[PDB]
């Protein structure tokens, strides 16, 4: 309500060589057929080349990089032992896909599913 314009700058990749290098240097979030930051599939190289050079992708990456500096409260405060040896499963006693997190012991998972940590993520997925 106090402006009518803004500045301009560019630091994005340019050409197939830059996009392939950017994918390799960020293999944990970017790939030859999917971008996790923008949670979108890239069914062909022409879509991959357009997506990684898009102004929308660059803004999404800038926001994601700023968010990727901390996290909210979680009941997983301390640990020492557990009633089961599960360490690579997908059960509710070890992980939560709504929040995309894992827990050391079933009691921590039970505490998470009834605490504010889960509810904060309900609103995140909902909106
Ligand atoms: Zn993207
Ligand atoms: Zn959860």
From Swiss-Prot:
Q: Which residues bind Zn(2+) 1?
A: 35, 38, 51, 57
Task: Keyword check for Zinc, yes or no.
Answer: yes
Q: Which residues are involved in binding Zn(2+) 2?
A: 96, 99, 112, 118
List, alphabetically, the GO terms of the cellular component aspect.
Answer: cytoplasm; nucleus
Keyword Repeat found: yes
| Subcellular compartments | Nucleus; Cytoplasm
Q: What are the record keywords, sorted?
A: Cytoplasm, Metal-binding, Nucleus, Repeat, RNA-binding, Zinc, Zinc-finger
Q: Where are the zinc fingers (Matrin-type)?
A: 33-63, 91-125
TM ranges? none
Signal peptide limits: none
> What Gene Ontology terms describe what this protein does at the molecular function level?
double-stranded RNA binding; zinc ion binding
Q: Which domain of life is it from?
A: Eukaryota
Give the main location. Answer: nucleus
Reproduce the free-text note on domains from the UniProt record.
The zinc-finger domains are required for binding to dsRNA, and also for nuclear localization.
What does this protein's UniProt record list under function? Binds preferentially to dsRNA, but also to RNA-DNA hybrids.
- According to UniProt, the name of this protein is Zinc finger protein 346
Task: List the gene name.
Answer: znf346
Q: Fragment boundaries within the full protein?
A: 2 to 128 of 524
């Amino acid at each position: 309500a106090d402006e009518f314009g803004n500045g301009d700058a560019l630091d994005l990749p340019v050409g197939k060589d830059a996009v392939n290098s950017l994918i390799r240097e960020n293999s944990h979030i970017f790939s030859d057929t999917q971008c996790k930051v923008c949670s979108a599939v890239l069914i062909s190289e022409s879509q991959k080349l357009a997506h990684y050079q898009s102004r929308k992708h660059a803004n999404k990456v800038r926001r994601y990089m700023a968010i990727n500096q901390g996290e909210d409260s979680v009941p997983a405060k301390k640990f020492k032992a557990a009633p089961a040896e599960i360490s690579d499963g997908e059960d509710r006693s070890k992980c939560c896909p709504v929040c995309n997190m894992t827990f050391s012991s079933p009691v921590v998972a039970e505490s998470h599913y009834i605490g504010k940590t889960h509810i904060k993520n309900l609103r995140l997925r909902e909106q």
